[PDB]
Amino acid sequence: GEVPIGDPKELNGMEIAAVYLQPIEMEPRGIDLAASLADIHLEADIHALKNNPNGFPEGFWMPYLTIAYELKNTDTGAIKRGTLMPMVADDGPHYGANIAMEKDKKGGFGVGNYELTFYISNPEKQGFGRHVDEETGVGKWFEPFKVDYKFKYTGTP
Amino acid sequence: GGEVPIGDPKELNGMEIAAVYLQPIEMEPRGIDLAASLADIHLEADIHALKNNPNGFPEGFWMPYLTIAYELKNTDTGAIKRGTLMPMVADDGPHYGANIAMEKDKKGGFGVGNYELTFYISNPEKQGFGRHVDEETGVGKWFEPFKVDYKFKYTGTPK
Numbered sequence: 001g002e003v004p005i006g007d008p009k010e011l012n013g014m015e016i017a018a019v020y021l022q023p024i025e026m027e028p029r030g031i032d033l034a035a036s037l038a039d040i041h042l043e044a045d046i047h048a049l050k051n052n053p054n055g056f057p058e059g060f061w062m063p064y065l066t067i068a069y070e071l072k073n074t075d076t077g078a079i080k081r082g083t084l085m086p087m088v089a090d091d092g093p094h095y096g097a098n099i100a101m102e103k104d105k106k107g108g109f110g111v112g113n114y115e116l117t118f119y120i121s122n123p124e125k126q127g128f129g130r131h132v133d134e135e136t137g138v139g140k141w142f143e144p145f146k147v148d149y150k151f152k153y154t155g156t157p
Numbered sequence: 158g159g160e161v162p163i164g165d166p167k168e169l170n171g172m173e174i175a176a177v178y179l180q181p182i183e184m185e186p187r188g189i190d191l192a193a194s195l196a197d198i199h200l201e202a203d204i205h206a207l208k209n210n211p212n213g214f215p216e217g218f219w220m221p222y223l224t225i226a227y228e229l230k231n232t233d234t235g236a237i238k239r240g241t242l243m244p245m246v247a248d249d250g251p252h253y254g255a256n257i258a259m260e261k262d263k264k265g266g267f268g269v270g271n272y273e274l275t276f277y278i279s280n281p282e283k284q285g286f287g288r289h290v291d292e293e294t295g296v297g298k299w300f301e302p303f304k305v306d307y308k309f310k311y312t313g314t315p316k
């Protein structure tokens with residue numbers, strides 16, 4: 001059910017990919033946009049690479065990230081921004097948001113060419129700690145960064 | 158190393174729940190954990206998904222966004238302290254942990270001896286971590302809050 005968004009990027013010890021699927025229903029209620037109001041569920045799939053410098057085992061989900069997105073229709077110039085929220089689905093933990101496309105009451109988010117940007121800040125922003133002792137410590141976290149994708153939105157799946 | 162195992166791990170609610178301690182650790186950011194020089198142990202909860210986890214976590218994955226309170230009771234002296242373990246990462250992965258004063262704590266009898274350790278665990282939804290519940294991609298309901306208990310002999314800081 002998942003449509004790839006552009007090509008994944010490897011950086012800061014992480015594999016960072018984007019996909020969209022049909023709208024999902026999330027609990028708790030009142031956080032994620034309700035499925036009937038949305039056209040897609042956008043997901044950031046973020047996992048540790050080999051030799052992750054912050055101690056995360058290869059393939060582990062990267063938790064406690066702060067992630068904002070910007071979605072730009074490059075045909076219309078229409079831009080929207082939001083946050084992705086941490087949650088779990090059948091395919092495990094990720095960061096996600098239901099997003100109105102055709103249903104965006106502002107308009108301009110229908111079928112077309114898009115640029116997607118993630119803006120990502122490290123887990124310390126949320127108070128997640130790291131050992132820094134000689135025996136068990138790990139390296140410094142990345143500074144906030146962005147990653148960019150280009151994709152064609154072909155309509156609510 | 159490695160760490161000192163506390164009691165036996167428990168397998169409950171789709172998770173392996175183990176307790177360990179080691180020497181006090183230095184943690185960043187500075188100021189949230191008790192300083193290493195003021196502590197005698199670093200206590201950890203090691204919690205990972207079992208096979209067939211009912212909440213969509215693949216086997217071996219760390220269970221994130223858990224709320225974990227601990228109670229440490231010296232059964233010889235009666236000394237009791239409580240706290241909450243904080244999520245963090247070390248060179249062998251993410252865990253929940255806290256630096257704790259034992260011998261250094263002069264406000265109680267927290268020296269070498271027999272201990273009961275209890276973890277009080279609440280599911281990730283308590284912290285607003287979400288779950289899909291639609292038919293196509295949804296997963297099972299989270300566990301209700303629960304406790305796990307360990308017995309161990311504290312023999313001092315690993316040296």
Ligand SMILES: [Cl-]
Pocket residue numbers: 005006007148149150
């Ligand atoms: Cl791309």
Ligand SMILES: [Cl-]
Pocket residue numbers: 163164165306307308
């Ligand atoms: Cl035990």
Ligand SMILES: [Cu+2]
Pocket residue numbers: 024041043087088089094095096097289
């Ligand atoms: Cu999701």
Ligand SMILES: [Cu+2]
Pocket residue numbers: 131182199201245246247252253254255
């Ligand atoms: Cu720790």
Ligand SMILES: [Fe+3]
Pocket residue numbers: 002019043089091094
């Ligand atoms: Fe997914």
Ligand SMILES: [Fe+3]
Pocket residue numbers: 160177201247249252
């Ligand atoms: Fe550990």
